[PDB]
Structures are given as C-alpha cells and as structure tokens.
Design an enzyme around this catalytic site. Sequence first.
Site, short mmCIF file in Angstrom:
data_model
loop_
_atom_site.label_atom_id
_atom_site.label_comp_id
_atom_site.label_asym_id
_atom_site.label_seq_id
_atom_site.Cartn_x
_atom_site.Cartn_y
_atom_site.Cartn_z
N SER A 45 0.80 -1.24 0.00
CA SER A 45 0.00 0.00 0.00
C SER A 45 0.83 1.29 0.00
O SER A 45 0.24 2.36 -0.18
CB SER A 45 -1.02 0.06 1.13
N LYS A 48 0.03 3.51 -2.90
CA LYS A 48 -1.13 4.41 -2.92
C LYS A 48 -0.70 5.84 -3.02
O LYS A 48 -1.42 6.67 -3.59
CB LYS A 48 -2.04 4.13 -1.71
N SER A 105 -6.10 3.58 4.03
CA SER A 105 -5.54 2.44 3.29
C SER A 105 -6.66 1.59 2.65
O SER A 105 -6.53 0.37 2.53
CB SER A 105 -4.56 1.65 4.12
N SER A 212 1.38 -3.35 3.85
CA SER A 212 1.66 -4.71 4.29
C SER A 212 1.10 -5.71 3.29
O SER A 212 0.22 -5.39 2.49
CB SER A 212 1.15 -4.99 5.71
O1 0JB Z 1 -4.69 -6.27 0.68
C1 0JB Z 1 -3.93 -6.75 1.52
N1 0JB Z 1 -3.50 -6.09 2.60
C2 0JB Z 1 -3.83 -4.77 2.94
C3 0JB Z 1 -5.07 -4.20 2.60
C4 0JB Z 1 -5.30 -2.87 2.94
C5 0JB Z 1 -4.39 -2.09 3.63
C6 0JB Z 1 -3.18 -2.70 3.99
C7 0JB Z 1 -2.19 -1.94 4.74
N2 0JB Z 1 -2.12 -0.61 4.78
N3 0JB Z 1 -1.10 -0.26 5.60
N4 0JB Z 1 -0.49 -1.39 6.04
N5 0JB Z 1 -1.22 -2.46 5.52
C8 0JB Z 1 -2.90 -4.03 3.68
C9 0JB Z 1 -3.39 -8.13 1.32
C10 0JB Z 1 -3.61 -8.75 0.12
C11 0JB Z 1 -3.12 -10.01 -0.14
C12 0JB Z 1 -2.35 -10.69 0.81
C13 0JB Z 1 -2.12 -10.06 2.03
N6 0JB Z 1 -1.46 -10.46 3.16
C14 0JB Z 1 -1.50 -9.44 4.05
N7 0JB Z 1 -2.24 -8.42 3.58
C15 0JB Z 1 -2.62 -8.76 2.30
#
Ligand code: 0JB
Length: 263
Positions: A45, A48, A105, A212
């Site tokens: 992310s 973004k 996010s 993440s």
């Molecule tokens: O969309 C995902 N993660 C996600 C979704 C939205 C926000 C975030 C995030 N933002 N800041 N840190 N994590 C992380 C995601 C997709 C596929 C496999 C995954 N394993 C961990 N997270 C995963």
Amino acid sequence: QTSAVQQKLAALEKSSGGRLGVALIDTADNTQVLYRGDERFPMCSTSKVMAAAAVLKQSETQKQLLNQPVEIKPADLVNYNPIAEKHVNGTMTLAELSAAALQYSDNTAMNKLIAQLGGPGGVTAFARAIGDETFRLDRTEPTLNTAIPGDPRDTTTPRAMAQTLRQLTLGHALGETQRAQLVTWLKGNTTGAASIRAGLPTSWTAGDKTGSGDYGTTNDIAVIWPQGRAPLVLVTYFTQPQQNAESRRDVLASAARIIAEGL
Ligand SMILES: O=C(Nc1cccc(-c2nnn[nH]2)c1)c1cccc2nc[nH]c12
C-alpha cells in the site's frame, strides 16, 4: 564503505530474520543513507502515494476533477474497504477516494484511483514522468500485495521511493496546491503510529503511508519534520521468507530509531 548506521541496520536485519531496505534523504544537506537501497521490495500500500499523486497531477489541468463522482458498486468492494463500503450504491469523489486510500488504506479507493489513471501502467507512467525509472505497478488491489520473493511485479527500491517521495512532498513534481494537499493527507494518516513514527522522538512530526502484504511484508514511507531540523524523507521496507509471516512494524520503528540516532 559501511557506516556505523549501516552496521546497526544490518544487525537489526539479522535479528529480525527478514530482509530490510532503508533509504533516508536528509534535506539539511541532501545526504543519503541507504541499506539495500537498490534492492527491489514489494511496495504494497505504499504504492497508494503514487496513485494519489498521479490523480493530483491530472487535477492541475482540471479544477473540478477532485470533485468528480465515481460510482461505488457492490461488486467493487474487495478485501479492505472501511470507507468505500459506506458508499456502495452511491458515489465518492476523487478527493474522497484519495483521502480514503491514503489515510485509511482503503483498497477499493485505490482501485478507483488506478482505474482513473487507465490501469496499473498509468501509475507507472506518472512515476516515469516525474523521473522515477524504478517504480512499477502491475496489478490492482488486492493482488498487488502478494509480495512473492523474487517477483518484480509491484516493486520499487528504497532509493527510488525516497527520491520520489521527496520530489512529491517537498519538491516540485506537483503544483504547489497539490503538494500541500498531498502533505495534508499524509500528515492525517491513521495507520502509522506503530511504524516509522514509533522510532522517532515524540517532539517530531511526520506524514506517512504504510503497507503490508504476504511474506510478512511490512512497509512505511514518511516525510518527517524533526524538531529544529530541515525535513527528512525515510523509506523502510521489510519482507520475510515465509508466505504466512506475521507483520513486524516494530522492525520499521527500530530502523527509524537507528536513523534518527545517526543524525
Ligand atoms: O490487501 C492486503 N492487505 C492490505 C489491505 C489494505 C491495507 C493494507 C495496509 N495498509 N497499511 N499497512 N497495511 C494491507 C493483502 C492482500 C493479499 C495478501 C495479504 N497479506 C496481508 N495483507 C494482504
């Protein structure tokens, strides 16, 4: 050469079991500190920021773009949609989508930014237009977070991302109005207190964007205003060998602490 700071980052990395990438730019003197600065990491992310910035660039020539509605349909919801789900069967503006993507996010909001730019390659095209030859976005949410070791898709290097973040937030890659909006958005992030910011002295301020994904991938990119100092730009990327590894925001905090102590 290997500096004291690089040695400390290597020791942190070793005790973490994963792979750490760090890039600092200190705008006091434009000097840089890198650790695995030219290795590729999955952005997750943190990408973004590039997407929102590319829409900000488009808005420079369309004063009403950010007020443009985008339909949110039930089929658009993906895996993490805390803002977009409230608006399904209605609309969100591109400003609302940008704020949701950056500050919460929201993955549906990111997909609408990517679609506004004509797909993942539109985000890459904007990166190239502002001098980043390294960044690549290849997929939409949620699959851009698969974070598979050795996979080039949806990656960048710490060096490239720090330079880009500098140009976007402190330099002139965007118009002045747009740069200020990006900084406001980043400063209002809700997700960052455990990551870079946890390693900084509490008197400092910052804006950041976390990410993440699989492989325990745990990322943060920040623009930092230390007390009494010119701003810093800091990227901390971390990824681990097993697909199901647990996030390690503490490692990002520790890297930031080492960086802060080395000024
Ligand atoms: O969309 C995902 N993660 C996600 C979704 C939205 C926000 C975030 C995030 N933002 N800041 N840190 N994590 C992380 C995601 C997709 C596929 C496999 C995954 N394993 C961990 N997270 C995963």
